[PDB]
């Protein structure tokens, strides 16, 4: 299958209470594998998945250097954004950066990403061709013109199609035993009377990886969205995910309803009915 | 400025069975800005040893965190999570229901 | 591998 690597970095200014906090986390697919937190004790990039631990001391030295330098750069970008938006030194602001790359089953480059958001809104993003920028407002167009003049897109493309995919391919190899897995959902259905006239059927999906999944209710084989509830997919805390979907049905009509489960770990989609 | 109110889910790592060790989770997601206060409660008392995940965010830039602690469910013990965020007027308490 | 590119706004 295809795979993704992403780093998610957050800078939060806090006037009066020190320099901005900077935290960065790295993921392959839905599995976190590194972190750096400027407020934590170690001041190093730290492992958060077993398969990254076999990286040598030079890895941790170089990754720490990059993420510490980037924290300083985004401290400066927080100051620049204040100037561009005519904001005071009093308030707290957020600067988020995401970047990474996708590879196919043969390990070849598919896509790259590099984008920034300021106070929760898009600021600037590298477009899909890795050759031009989307600027979200007039302030970001200053940055876009600057980055065009300095050919930053070409620098980004060199990383995203090179060292980015080199890393993703390496991590997939070192983390072979766990990152290639598809844990299918373990499914079951519960039944709860809620009145003399209605009952809730709840269809559970537990223990699955990756997180992508679909749960849908049908009645008499037709899609049913009214009188349903569906929670957002949530981490179990052990590297797998959970979801459920519920429907409120007339008492005695339970057998008209089916829950449909699609997940890559499943040989075929499931059609589940209340048992009894 | 753009602010987003946290979503909150409180649930167990495995289907709860009385007398069997488990993990109690509070997943907060979809919020902005990033500061958030999350407590896990047992019978109304703050649980002390609670760990949480490293701050991360989704494609739409909203943040998420998982808070978790070990627990062994009983019939009588009540659990909850308590969340505060600048978008909230007062703390939000969500009770744990082993069926949800 | 973290990005090596550090540029200002
Ligand atoms: Mg543009
Ligand atoms: Mg492994």
Numbering used by the authors:
A (entry chain A): 1 to 276
B (entry chain B): 0 to 99
C (entry chain C): 1 to 9
What do the authors of the reporting publication say about this deposited model?
HLA-A*24:02 allele, highly prevalent in Indigenous populations, is associated with influenza-induced mortality, although the basis for this association is unclear. Here, we define CD8+ T-cell immune landscapes against IAV and IBV, restricted by the mortality-associated HLA-A24 allomorph. We identify immunodominant protective CD8+ T-cell epitopes, one towards IAV and six towards IBV, with A24/PB2550–558-specific CD8+ T cells being cross-reactive between IAV and IBV. Consistent with the HLA-A24 peptide-binding motif generated by NetMHC4.037,38 motif viewer, enrichment of Tyr/Phe at P2 and Phe/Leu/Ile at P9 were observed.
We observed robust comparable mouse and human responses to the overlapping IBV NP164–173 and NP165–173 peptides. To determine this possibility, we solved the structures of the overlapping B/NP164–173 and B/NP165–173 peptides in complex with HLA-A24 at a resolution of 2.75 and 1.51 Å, respectively. The B/NP164–173 and B/NP165–173 peptides adopted a canonical extended conformation in the cleft of HLA-A24 molecule. Three residues were exposed to the solvent for possible TCR recognition (P1-Tyr, P6-Arg, P8-Thr). The substitution of P2-Tyr (NP164–173) for P2-Phe (NP165–173) occurred without major structural rearrangement, as both residues were large aromatic residues filling the B pocket. However, the additional residue changed the secondary anchor residue at P3 from a small P3-Ser (NP165–173) to a large P3-Phe (NP164–173). Thus, the structures of HLA-A24 presenting the two NP peptides showed that, despite being overlapping peptides that differ only by one residue, the NP164–173 and NP165–173 peptides adopt different structural conformations. As a result, both peptides exposed different residues to the solvent, and hence would most likely be recognized by different TCRαβ repertoires. Cross-reactivity was demonstrated towards the NP165–173 epitope (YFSPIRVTF variant 1 (Vic only)), in which B/Malaysia/2505/2004-expanded CD8+ T-cells responded towards the Yam variant (YFSPIRITF v2 (Yam only)) following ICS assay. In the case of B/NP164/165–173, responses to both peptides are equivalently immunodominant in HLA-A24+ individuals, providing breadth to the overall CD8+ T-cell response.
